[PDB]
């Protein structure tokens, strides 16, 4: 655990491989590289690939329990102290352009003061962010700077998705503005994404703090400071989002309340339009009858007689409508 | 970073600045002033404005991680220790004069004992309150008096706000009188405002207690005591408000069941008038036909006969109404 | 704060003013009294009186930060340490017959080892209890035993209030008594008063524990023991009302499903009556028509034949109801 | 206070009283007995009796604050250290066959290191089981053996009861086996029963825990371990029961959703029957008319010609629902 | 007690027993065996067998309280140290195809450094898994390896089960895919199984951590570390599952939302079809009448008159639907 060679880390199926000068150095690896704490080496892999998997399960540099903890196993943000070794993994929020369900994006990093290795399956964009700000050399200095910078990308895109849900539900003032119903099958979607992001950020906050509260031998205390309030930077993100689970609590309840209000104002029409069904029992009840008797023969022009008495009934009960509305 | 000349902090596009005397009064900022513990000064911006933002990003008087932080991006009622630097950022309750949604107002203070700087986007009632207090002449003596006074106005207006929420919901005694329903879409914004007040007071409670817990090098211990019971003042304030989220809990559930049981009474009317109008289709059954036979011709004057017999049918099943009310 | 003259305490608009002998008896206040810890005198005010407000805000006997606190603006209980001074503010359970909403029964006591002040606005039956018990010689000895006995009266009066709503709740076993229904808009009163008992007892419990938390120069350790098990009395009242919001929760849900199943019986009757009004369209569909042809003229006396056919259709589909209840 | 005599504890209206030998034996009382820790004595009363109340209020054994409160006051269990005294009060569950509501079957036991005294109101089968253990002859050794045996008794019977409601609700899965509805009001009363058992058990493993850390002068460390793990045996007791309030949480909700599923079946039938009886009203529209014109007289035998078209409306719309189910 | 003979633990009706070589190997028992920590023996039984029942009821090697505890009686995911003894008792997942209810698959272990013994009632597939691990020679080294390996089996199996219903409720995306209903009586099964696995895993996570924090002689610090991240390996298991109680919380609410929505758009038919149900007292209201007058005889061909005026009623008020849709 004192000498590291550039050859065994040099993988053909490796996606990404770099040196770290201490500035943001863009230097791809060789087969004759000196790798230490003075020369940290970023990697990035894809365990779907062939020799990424073989080198992932066979390399003599990293231990055995972290071999098959590193090729698509967990559903959780673990950290694990391995003496000098340090396993982190934490989750990001992307996919293709279209997977709004399954906000799980794994990214797994076995790392120490000398050599890191990062591994993914689907395309992380936060790792694309930490790539895309180092070609000009303003990115990370070392592995500690790498870790706090990728936590800055994670809090930035995770925080943007937090406020993205937040202005999806703050767009739901439509529940009182006209009392417009939200679209059919919609609140379960972002409310689903909301609670699953509770169960991913909610251990990710103290995986960040469990980084920052613990003294790894190779951060700076400035990196532990910005790590500390970046852990809090996830923290009020997560109380924003369980404020949003409350807000979809009231939202999802009172939309059911207002559609049963639509039931009630429908049964206004069922009530009074059932009171239009009232004189039918005497509409046919005197007139659809074929019997040998005298129902209305005693007075000529009987049509206006029932034509006024049925609205004596309708207007009278209509005057009871402004009195009791029952019985 | 020992002393600061008065023109260095001087910003044209600032809202203003000031000079705290220590007697509770104030003096405006001059160009050749001395900024120290002997002469503390409040300086206030509006970071919407242009050179406000330029000085906000380019001054040498505050570190990098508070440079962008005073530019209006977090939903975080946060304190951030920067050694001698001390950032706080707290929330108030306004908008324009008309926004009952979005009761969030950001105010920010970067702070050391010499200069204190408050930046806002929109206006703050509390900052106006300590304005009228400070050209009144018995406002803040110093920066400690600044903090305890601005927290007195923040807690005072927030406590008044949750007070008028409390009498809006204790005004909801239409549950008992008439069982009168609240207006269509009205508890979504009371209950919405209520939970968002939980989210913006509950980190603010321990931003207050997190101020009063540590020993900053510039407060009096009397200001720590005032800070302490004002922290608990907002604390049991939010105990009133989640008492109110329980009270909108029962209130929303019982309005849902009371209009639901109103609907149940409406279909009770539909049921009773349904079995009252059983014999209408049956009277069309016996009497609304066209056959080559004898319907009732063997006995004269059947109109009195059937208009008796359906009525005694209705009264019979009406005795089964009070008798059974089933089947 | 070494000696107090009998006129500074003396207020004309004072409701009560007393002299704790230490023997459990009492004496009224005189004008030339020297009161101390050996002569712990007593007050009771009503701050809505104007001279009560004047002495309440202008006396030199209590500091400024508790001057306004005794003037009736709280929504809450507290205890605030003021060095030698000690503030408690504290709630009770009172009103006349027509105040079962708004249990806001305030009771404020600023005190030390020598003097107390006990201000109210509306009457307090606990203070009425110890006023009913101090003249008979078996009241309190001094201020420690005073607020001991005060907490005795209000915690067993609040305890019997909690017991009273509890016997209403256990009087709601009519849910299984043939599903007998609570009155229209009634559980919002028990549930509302219940949770407002949770809020106005819950900081009160650790007001009491916060009394016996520290040593104070005017209690006994026996009175601290009395304080802790009386806090145990109240806190077990708090678990009583916690289980009452639970049991009231399941009550409020089951009455809603009782309304749902009664409505299911209403539309059960509407379903069976709908199948009873299936032969409307065959009834008029063969018989109420007016066309130039032969519908049933080919066989004489067809009244029994449509009686037979609609009976076998109705009883037939009733047998299909006995087959599979649907389709 | 020392060398307690048998005449002091001799109560005629007591239920019984014995000595504890150490073997689990049993010996009745005399009037010349030496009650010590070498010969511990159990007393058992029924405090509703008049002389039981007289000795209960007037004995020179136990102090004043445990005199009255031992006779029917606490709605809840507790411990209370009284120096040498140790008040305990527990709760068990019994009745006749008919008191399954009101599971408050109390147990008030003042403990002193020589005389231990138990008062009940109604009969408790737990102490009946300890009675069977002691006339059995291998019951309690001493007051410590008394305590572990009574806690084992009502711990076992509490565990059997929570097992009884557990396999009541594990029978409640015919609601997935062809969705058999639970009987009327059945969830409410056992849901009530185990939630008041959350009002008892969560105040019971804490009174056992305040037996656990409480190094009493008369416990044994073996028996400390005995009521330690029998305390946590009750601990997995109440995690069973709040798991069961979750399980009747879901079980309470899903019967409501399946209730509206059956309601959706019958308004499915009301919908299709309403649209299939739309042509009835237009049949009366064309054929229930008495006017001087030519409705359909221009072609002979119109009965088949409209009996076809009503069928093609019915089967036509019946083909529209097989593609749309809507409008 | 020291050199315990293999004949003492030899049971005829044992399911099996072996030694542990320290390599993962397997050797059957004899009756001339010396058992220690150097030769660790594992027994596995089935306590329903009467010979094994007599053995574990009557063997003199294990203590008294663990005798009936190992006899298979109660829902115990717990641990109790007995000095040199150690009772652990855990829960797994097994059954045939038809035991998805009753997820209790108990395994019980009395153990020490020397003689470690496991009882069960129904088969555990995790114990079968470690049997398959040891019979090939790659099983556990010692009793500590036996414990951590059987924890690896059953946490792997419980972990893939909580994964299994975790992606069974992700197969509940029919909620927005056409808003397709879940099957009738289905979420009580899945929702049942995840709350019951909160009931099981929630004491089992800290039976694991309570093993890990307990310095035991028969363990190793490597197995303590492996014990601790297998403890948290489960622990992210259970926050996955209460995340899933939230996700079936929103799912179970919105299915009632969407099926009442199906009722809601369903009674559009019972609104517009109700206002085509109103003119039945008009189209027969003038025309199904038998009276001696002139209803429409003054103008010829009345059939094309109402044949258009019912259209100017229906289409006109149908245009009032596009105006206000109510009243």
Chain E CB contacts of D264 below 8 Å? 259, 262-263
Q: Where are the beta strands (DSSP E) in chain A?
A: 16-19, 41-44, 79-82, 85-89, 108-111, 116-119
D180: contact with C, CB 8 A cutoff:
no
How many residue contacts between A and B have a Cβ separation below 8 Å? Answer: 141
A249: contact with E, CB 8 A cutoff:
no
Beta bridge partners of B20: B26
H/E stretch holding A243 reads: helix A221-275
Nearest to A300 among E232, E253, E292 (CB): E292
Task: Choose among A193, A194, A189, A130: nearest CA to A156.
Answer: A130
CA distance E41 to E34: 10
- Structure solved using which method? cryo-EM
Among left, alpha and beta (phi > 0; psi -120 to 50; other), residue D261 is: alpha
Question: Which two tokens mark C287?
Answer: 């018989």
Residue C271 CB: number of other CB atoms within 10 A? 21
Answer yes or no: are the C-beta atoms of A30 and A48 closer than 8 Å.
no
Nearest to C240 among D75, D185, D289 (CB): D75
Nearest to D192 among C250, C271, C274 (CB): C250
Question: Which two tokens mark C316?
Answer: 């037939």
Chain A CB contacts of B185 below 8 Å? 175-176, 179, 254, 258
Helix, strand, or coil (residue A258): helix
Nearest to D291 among E267, E279, E303 (CB): E303
**Burial (CB count <10 Å: 0-12, 13-18, 19+), residue E100:** middle
Q: Do D251 and E287 touch (CB under 8 A)?
A: no
C67: contact with B, CB 8 A cutoff:
no
Answer yes or no: are the C-beta atoms of E266 and E244 closer than 8 Å.
no
Residue with tokens 């109680």: E245
C-alpha angle C112/C117/C123, rounded to 5°? Answer: 140
C258: contact with B, CB 8 A cutoff:
no
Chain A CB contacts of B310 below 8 Å? 285
CA distances to E128, E148, E149, E157, E159 from E154, rounded to whole Å, are: 10, 10, 9, 5, 8
CA distance A88 to A208: 10
Answer yes or no: are the C-beta atoms of D262 and C264 closer than 8 Å.
yes
Q: Do D250 and E75 touch (CB under 8 A)?
A: no
CA distances to A56, A62, E148 from A108, rounded to whole Å, are: 12, 14, 25
A313: contact with E, CB 8 A cutoff:
no
Answer yes or no: are the C-beta atoms of C171 and C250 closer than 8 Å.
no
Question: Which two tokens mark E221?
Answer: 């610090």
Q: Show which subunits contact E, needing at least 3 CB pairs below 8 angstroms.
A: A, D
C-alpha angle E110/E116/E120, rounded to 5°? Answer: 60
Nearest to A257 among B256, B303, B306 (CB): B256
Q: Do D260 and E260 touch (CB under 8 A)?
A: yes
- Find, in chain A, the residue whose alpha carbon is nearest to that of E285: A283
Chain B CB contacts of A236 below 8 Å? 74-78, 203
- Find, in chain E, the residue whose alpha carbon is nearest to that of D270: E270
How many residue contacts between B and C have a Cβ separation below 8 Å? Answer: 128
Residues 102-121 in C contacting B (C-alpha not used; CB under 8 Å)? 102
Chain E CB contacts of D295 below 8 Å? 303
Answer yes or no: are the C-beta atoms of C276 and D285 closer than 8 Å.
no
Q: End-to-end CA distance of chain C, in Å? A: 90
CA distance C10 to C16: 10
Three-state helix/strand/coil letters over chain C: CCCEECCCCCCCCCCEEEEECCCCCEEECCCCCEECCCCCEEEEEECCCHHHHHHHHHCCCCCHHHCCHHHCCCCCCEEEEECCEEEEEEEECCCCCCCCCCCCEEEEEEECCCCEEEEECCCCHHHHHHHCCCCCCCCCCCHHHHHHHHHHHHHHHHHHHHHHHHHHHHHHHHHCCCCCCCCCCCHHHHHHHHHHHHHHHHHHHHHHHHHCCCCCCCCCHHHHHHHHHHHHHHHHHHHHHHHHHHHHHHHHHHHHHHHHHHHHHHHHHHHHHHHHCCCHHHHHHHHCCCCCCCCCCCCCCCHHHHHHHHHHHHHHHHHHHHHHCCC
Residue with tokens 């009144």: B136
C293: contact with B, CB 8 A cutoff:
no
Phi, psi of A130 (to 5 degrees): -75, -20
CA distance A38 to C298: 112
Chain C closest-CA separation from residue B128 CA (Å)? 23
Q: Do D267 and E269 touch (CB under 8 A)?
A: no
Nearest to D278 among E188, E203, E273 (CB): E273
A270: contact with E, CB 8 A cutoff:
yes
- Find, in chain D, the residue whose alpha carbon is nearest to that of C291: D302
* Spatial CB neighbours of D69, under 8 Å, sequence gap ≥ 6: D87
Q: Do B175 and C185 touch (CB under 8 A)?
A: yes
Chain E closest-CA separation from residue A297 CA (Å)? 6
Task: Choose among A289, A314, A167, A22: nearest CA to B282.
Answer: A289
CA distances to A236, D144, E191, E245 from A195, rounded to whole Å, are: 15, 51, 16, 10
H/E stretch holding D56 reads: helix D50-58
CA distance E43 to A168: 60
Q: Provide the b/e sequence for B265-296 (b: ≥16 CB within 10 Å).
A: ebbbbbbbebbbbbbbbbbbbbbbbebeeeeb
Chain B closest-CA separation from residue A285 CA (Å)? 7
Answer yes or no: are the C-beta atoms of E47 and E122 closer than 8 Å.
no
Chain B CB contacts of C255 below 8 Å? 257
Strands D115-120 and D41-46: parallel
- Find, in chain D, the residue whose alpha carbon is nearest to that of E266: D271
CA distance C187 to A246: 24
C267: contact with D, CB 8 A cutoff:
yes
C196: contact with D, CB 8 A cutoff:
no
Q: Provide the b/e sequence for E118-131 (b: ≥16 CB within 10 Å).
A: bbbebbbebbebbb
Chain D CB contacts of E289 below 8 Å? 290
Nearest to E270 among D176, D274, D289 (CB): D274
Q: How many CA atoms, within 13 angstroms, populate the side-chain half-sphere of residue E198?
A: 22
Strands E85-92 and E78-82: antiparallel
B220: contact with C, CB 8 A cutoff:
no
A180: contact with B, CB 8 A cutoff:
no
D266: contact with C, CB 8 A cutoff:
yes
Which of D248, D289, D317 would you mutate first to test chain E, the one with the most E CBs within 10 A? D289
D299: contact with E, CB 8 A cutoff:
no
CA distance D156 to D154: 5
Q: Do D293 and E273 touch (CB under 8 A)?
A: no
* Spatial CB neighbours of C96, under 8 Å, sequence gap ≥ 6: none
Chain D CB contacts of C264 below 8 Å? 259, 262-263, 266
Which of B230, B232, B236, B273 would you mutate first to test chain C, the one with the most C CBs within 10 A? B236
Domains detected in chain A:
6-260 (3.30.460.20), 276-286+305-327 (no CATH)
Nearest to D293 among E101, E191, E302 (CB): E302
C320: contact with D, CB 8 A cutoff:
no
Question: Which two tokens mark A104?
Answer: 């799980």
Nearest to B267 among C199, C255, C263 (CB): C263
CA distance D259 to D246: 20
Task: Choose among B111, B121, B114: nearest CA to B150.
Answer: B111
Q: Do A291 and B287 touch (CB under 8 A)?
A: yes
Q: Do C294 and D310 touch (CB under 8 A)?
A: no
Helix, strand, or coil (residue B43): strand
Among left, alpha and beta (phi > 0; psi -120 to 50; other), residue A185 is: left
Resolution (A): 4.2
Chain A CB contacts of B288 below 8 Å? 284, 288-290
Nearest to A276 among E175, E253, E278 (CB): E278
CA distances to A101, A171, B268, E233, E257 from A257, rounded to whole Å, are: 28, 19, 21, 42, 10
């Amino acid at each position: 655990m004192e000498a590291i060679k550039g050859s065994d880390v040099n993988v053909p199926d490796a996606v990404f491989a770099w040196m770290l000068d201490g500035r943001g150095g863009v230097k791809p690896l060789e087969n004759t590289d000196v790798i230490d704490e003075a020369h940290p080496c970023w990697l990035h892999l894809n365990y779907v690939h062939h020799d990424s998997a073989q080198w992932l399960a066979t390399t003599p540099l990293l231990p055995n329990n972290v071999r098959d903890a590193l090729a698509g196993e967990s559903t959780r943000p673990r950290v694990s102290r391995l003496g000098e070794g340090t396993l982190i993994t934490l989750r990001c929020i992307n996919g293709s352009t279209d997977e709004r369900p399954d906000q799980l994006v794994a990214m797994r990093v076995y790392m120490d003061g000398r050599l890191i290795v990062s591994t993914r399956q689907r395309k992380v964009l936060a790792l694309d962010d930490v790539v895309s700000d180092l070609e000009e050399g303003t990115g990370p200095t070392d592995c500690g700077g790498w870790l706090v910078d990728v936590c800055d990308a994670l809090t930035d895109h995770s925080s943007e998705f937090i406020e993205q849900l937040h202005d999806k539900i703050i767009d739901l003032e439509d529940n009182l503005l006209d009392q417009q119903i939200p679209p059919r099958g919609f609140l379960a979607l972002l409310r689903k994404q909301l609670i699953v992001m509770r169960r991913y950020m909610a251990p990710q906050r103290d995986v960040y703090a469990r980084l920052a509260s613990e003294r790894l031998p190779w951060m700076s205390d400035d990196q532990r400071r910005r790590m500390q309030d970046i852990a809090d930077r996830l923290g009020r993100g997560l109380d924003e989002i369980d404020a949003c689970i409350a807000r979809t609590g009231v939202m999802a309840d009172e939309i059911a309340q207002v559609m049963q209000e639509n039931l009630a104002r429908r049964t206004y029409t069922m009530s009074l339009m059932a009171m239009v069904f009232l004189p039918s029992t005497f509409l046919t009840g005197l007139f659809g009858v074929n019997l040998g008797g005298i129902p209305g023969g005693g007075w000529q022009f009987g049509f206006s007689i029932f034509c006024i008495l049925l609205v004596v009934l309708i207007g009278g009960v209509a005057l009871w409508l402004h009195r009791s509305k029952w019985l």
